[PDB]
């Protein structure tokens, strides 16, 4: 037969931090693998659509 009831209250403010987006990158596949190299590019062509 015992119940607890608040006689006062507090207004509390808290903070929730959520990521929304990441840095958008783009990669030049040929330049990265075979930068300014004709021979490397010609061998790179043999790997198709990668």
């Amino acid at each position: 037969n015992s119940i607890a009831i608040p006689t006062n209250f507090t207004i509390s403010v808290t903070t929730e931090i959520l990521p929304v987006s990441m840095t958008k990158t783009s990669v030049d596949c040929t330049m990265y693998i075979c930068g300014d190299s004709t021979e490397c590019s010609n061998l790179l062509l043999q790997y198709g659509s990668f």
Partner: protein
């Protein structure tokens, strides 16, 4: 179809090539062998080096 599409990357090409090496030091003593007062014998052979 209507939209924005990603195509091949662009580069700004070079217009000329440059090659830089340090000041050329003294040369092999080839001049002394050919521009000699008297030529060397088979036994008086030289060993150009370094």
């Amino acid at each position: 179809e209507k939209g924005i599409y990603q195509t091949s990357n662009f580069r700004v090409q070079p217009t000329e090539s440059i090659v830089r090496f340090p000041n050329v030091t003294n040369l092999c003593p080839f001049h002394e062998v050919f521009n000699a007062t008297r030529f060397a014998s088979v036994y008086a052979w030289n060993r150009t080096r370094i």
